């Protein structure tokens, strides 16, 4: 499907255009596409966030096309913040767009913090081949109900994350019924400053 690679472009979202960028892998391209959601739009989170980039690099290394996008209101994406509700619809729109362009592909959903919540919400509604959360903000009220996730779920978490505390994520992983692959980076903060190479390696190791 003719879609320019490694450049920002716009697609139709629920409330306006969504800014998207895709990548295509450098070797065998698997019939799996990963969509990666960014951290909190109200705290400067965008599709260009470095943890988002790292997730994309990991998925690319694994042979997946990747799709990153800005939630409504962010960057060139039109509209305004919608309480985590419309943001779910934004991801759902990007997901439909992926399914339209690559109908044969399985889907991976991934996200960092706010984006981990949004992607988990969608993966709870539509079983996908793999869900990936980095620093899922499990204190969000909307996380409480995500107890029987059908999609396989990898959670990567720094144990020195002060924004999303390890013990809270651990407790969430413990309380939910469905199995989670819970991978912890020792000494990593919420932002993985200087640990992005290791984060990529950790993702690849656990997703290969």
Residues that bind Na ion (CB under 5 A): 39-40, 113-114
- Max CA separation in the chain (angstroms): 45
Question: Which residue lies nearer to Na ion by CB, 40 or 121?
Answer: 40
Give the neighbor-by-neighbor strand order of the sheet with 180-185: 9-12, 17-23, 65-69, 32-37, 106-112, 130-134, 153-158, 180-185
Residue 129 Cβ vs Na ion, minimum distance, rounded to whole Å = 24
Nearest residue to Na ion on Cβ basis: 113
Question: Which residue lies nearer to Na ion by CB, 39 or 152?
Answer: 39
Residue 126 Cβ vs Na ion, minimum distance, rounded to whole Å = 22
Only one residue has tokens 């969509």, namely: 35
Question: Which residue lies nearer to Na ion by CB, 32 or 138?
Answer: 138
Question: Which residue lies nearer to Na ion by CB, 44 or 179?
Answer: 44
Question: Which residue lies nearer to Na ion by CB, 114 or 153?
Answer: 114
Rg (CA), the chain: 16
Question: Nearest to residue 56, comparing CAs of 48, 47, 66, 46?
Answer: 66
Residue 74 Cβ vs Na ion, minimum distance, rounded to whole Å = 6
Question: Which residue lies nearer to Na ion by CB, 13 or 65?
Answer: 13
Residue 87 Cβ vs Na ion, minimum distance, rounded to whole Å = 11
Contact predicate 183/206, CB 8 Å: yes
Q: Six-digit token pair at 121?
A: 């919400």
Residue 73 Cβ vs Na ion, minimum distance, rounded to whole Å = 5
Residue 208 Cβ vs Na ion, minimum distance, rounded to whole Å = 27
DSSP 126-165: S--SEEEEES--TTSGGGTT--S--S-EEEEEETT-SSS-
What H or E segment, with its residue span, contains residue 18? strand 17-23
């Amino acid at each position: 499907s003719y879609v320019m690679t490694n450049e920002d472009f716009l697609i139709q979202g629920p409330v306006g255009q969504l800014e998207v960028m895709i990548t295509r892998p450098k070797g065998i391209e698997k019939s799996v596409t990963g969509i990666i959601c960014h951290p909190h739009p109200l705290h400067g989170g965008t599709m260009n966030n470095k943890v988002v980039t790292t997730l994309a690099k990991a998925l690319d290394e694994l042979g997946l096309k990747t799709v990153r996008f800005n939630f409504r209101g962010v960057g060139k994406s039109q509209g305004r913040y919608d309480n985590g509700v419309g943001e779910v619809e934004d991801l759902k729109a990007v997901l439909r767009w992926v399914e339209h362009h690559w109908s044969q592909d399985d889907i991976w959903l991934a996200g960092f913090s706010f984006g981990a919540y949004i992607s988990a919400k969608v993966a709870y509604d539509q079983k996908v081949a793999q869900l990936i959360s980095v620093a899922p903000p499990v204190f969000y009220e909307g996380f409480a109900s995500l107890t029987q996730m059908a999609s396989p779920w990898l959670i990567v978490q720094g144990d020195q994350d002060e924004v999303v505390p390890f013990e809270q994520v651990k407790a969430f992983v413990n309380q939910i019924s469905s199995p989670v692959e819970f991978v912890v980076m020792s000494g990593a903060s919420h932002f993985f400053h200087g640990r992005l190479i290791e984060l990529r390696e950790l993702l690849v190791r656990n997703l290969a």
